[PDB]
């Protein structure tokens, strides 16, 4: 990991920015993955899958 060390860990300002980006992108990726699992486990149960949606007299 010394190649990555020489680029990110050398300065604490860069290391702090790396942590900020990792929290930003990492949380977005986990959020996307959780939503994919949520959709796959609940097929046909969402509000968008109501057959008579928009057809109330």
């Amino acid at each position: 990991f010394e190649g990555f060390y020489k680029l990110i860990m050398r300065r604490n300002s860069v290391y702090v920015t790396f942590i900020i980006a990792g929290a930003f992108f990492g949380e977005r990726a986990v959020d996307y993955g959780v939503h994919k699992l949520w959709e796959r486990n609940n097929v046909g149960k969402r509000y968008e899958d109501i057959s008579v949606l928009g057809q109330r007299p």
Binding site: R11, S13, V16, T17, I20, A21, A23, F24
Partner: peptide
């Protein structure tokens, strides 16, 4: 001449954190 680089490096971190706490993607 490393205090200036320290300021620029910390300015990027402050900018990166600001876009991280407040995420104004729907405003830009």
């Amino acid at each position: 001449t490393i205090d200036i680089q320290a300021a620029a490096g910390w300015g990027i971190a402050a900018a990166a954190g600001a876009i991280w706490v407040v995420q104004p993607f729907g405003w830009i």
